[PDB]
Design a protein around this nucleic acid. Structure first.
Ligand SMILES: [K+]
Ligand SMILES: [K+]
Length: 327
DNA sequence: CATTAGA
DNA sequence: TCTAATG
C-alpha cells in the first residue's frame, strides 16, 4: 500500500504504456500481474533479486526494479515520458470516443492535437465529434448540488411519461459523493422482466421525454436497453449556463433491479466484500441476481428480490445505507 | 463483460 | 462480421 508503492506505480506506468503506445498486450499484461504481486508482498523490496522470487517476476522486470531502487528513476520511464508520440497518444485518448486504436491511427495521420482534431472533424465519428465538442465540459466534475437538480428533473419526466416507472440514480451520488463524474440512471418497469420479451419503447419513451424538454441534448448511442448521451441544466436567467454533462440511462427487467441497483451503487470494495460474504452465507451475488449455493460445488436458482433489503436479509447482514456502502 | 457503432 | 469504445 505504500511500502512497495514506487515499484508498483512505476510498473503500471510501464504497463500502461505498452498497452497504449505499443500494441504489447502481453508485456502490458506482464507488468500487470507483477505490479499486482509485488503489491501484496509484505515487505520492502530491497533488490530485484528479492522481487524476482515472485510469481510474474522475471528477469526483465527485476532489472527494472533494480534501477528504480538504485537511482530514483528509470530511463525507459524517463524516455517515454518525454516521447512526443506516446504523449500524443495519451492525450487524444481523453477525447471520448477515442480509444488507443484511434489514437495511434490518428497520430500517424499526424493528428496530435486538439486543434489537429478540429481541422479534421471529418475524420472523426459522431461519438468522437461530440466528445470533441464537449472536451472541456466532459472532463469537469458534477457537483452534487447539480446532481440533485439533475436527479430532480429526471425523476420528473420519468414519472410524467409513465407512473409505473422506477428510476434510480446510482453510483457515488447514491453513496453521498460531494461530486460525481456523470450520471448513472438505472431504469425499470414492471412490464419488463427476464422473459416478457422487451418493450424497446420502454427505454425510448423517456429518452424522448427528457429530449423534448431539452434535458438531453445529444445522443452518443442509443440502443433498446442502453442510452448514452449528453445533458444540460437549463441555463438560468442568464449570466450562467450549465456545462455539458454525460448521462446514461439503461433499461432493466423489473426482476433484476435491486441487485443491479445494489451493484452499481458500489462501492467497488463494498460490493466485493458484500459478495465475499454471500459465499459463506451460502450464496452468490452478481449484477443480476442472487443464487443459493449447492454443496456439489455450485448451484443455481435465483432468489426473489423486491428490494436492497432481501438481498441483505438473505445474507443475514446489516442493511447498510448507501451513504456507508463505502467499504 | 455486455451493449452499441461502424465499416 | 468483426473490432473498437464505454462503462
Ligand atoms: K519467478
Ligand atoms: K477516450
Amino acid at each position: 500500500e505504500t511500502l512497495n508503492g514506487g515499484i508498483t506505480d512505476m510498473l503500471t506506468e510501464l504497463a500502461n504504456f505498452e498497452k497504449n503506445v505499443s500494441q504489447a498486450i502481453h508485456k502490458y499484461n506482464a507488468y500487470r500481474k507483477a505490479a499486482s504481486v509485488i503489491a501484496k508482498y509484505p515487505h520492502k523490496i530491497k533488490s530485484g533479486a528479492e522481487a524476482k522470487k515472485l510469481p510474474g517476476v522475471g528477469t526483465k522486470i527485476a532489472e527494472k526494479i533494480d534501477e528504480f531502487l538504485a537511482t530514483g528513476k528509470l530511463r525507459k520511464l524517463e524516455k517515454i515520458r518525454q516521447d512526443d508520440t506516446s504523449s500524443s497518444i495519451n492525450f487524444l485518448t481523453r477525447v471520448s470516443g477515442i480509444g488507443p486504436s484511434a489514437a495511434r491511427k490518428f497520430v500517424d495521420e499526424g493528428i496530435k492535437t486538439l486543434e489537429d482534431l478540429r481541422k479534421n472533424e471529418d475524420k472523426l465519428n459522431h461519438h468522437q465529434r461530440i466528445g470533441l465538442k464537449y472536451f472541456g465540459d466532459f472532463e469537469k466534475r458534477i457537483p452534487r448540488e447539480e446532481m440533485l437538480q439533475m436527479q430532480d428533473i429526471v425523476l420528473n419526466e420519468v414519472k410524467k411519461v409513465d407512473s409505473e416507472y422506477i428510476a434510480t440514480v446510482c453510483g457515488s451520488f447514491r453513496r453521498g459523493a460531494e461530486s460525481s463524474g456523470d450520471m448513472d440512471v438505472l431504469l425499470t418497469h414492471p412490464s419488463f422482466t427476464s422473459e416478457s420479451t422487451k418493450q424497446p419503447k420502454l427505454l425510448h419513451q423517456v429518452v424522448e421525454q427528457l429530449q423534448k424538454v431539452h434535458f438531453i441534448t445529444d445522443t452518443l448511442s442509443k440502443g433498446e436497453t442502453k442510452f448514452m448521451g449528453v445533458c444540460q441544466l437549463p441555463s438560468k436567467n442568464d449570466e450562467k449556463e450549465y456545462p455539458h454533462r454525460r448521462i446514461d440511462i439503461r433499461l432493466i427487467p423489473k426482476d433484476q433491479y435491486y441487485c443491479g441497483v445494489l451493484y452499481f451503487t458500489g462501492s467497488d470494495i463494498f460490493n466485493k466484500n458484500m459478495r465475499a460474504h454471500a459465499l459463506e452465507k451460502g450464496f452468490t451475488i452478481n449484477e443480476y441476481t442472487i443464487r443459493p449455493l449447492g454443496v456439489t460445488g455450485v448451484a443455481g436458482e435465483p432468489l426473489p428480490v423486491d428490494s436492497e433489503k432481501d438481498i441483505f436479509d438473505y445474507i443475514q447482514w446489516k442493511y447498510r445505507e448507501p451513504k456507508d456502502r463505502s467499504e
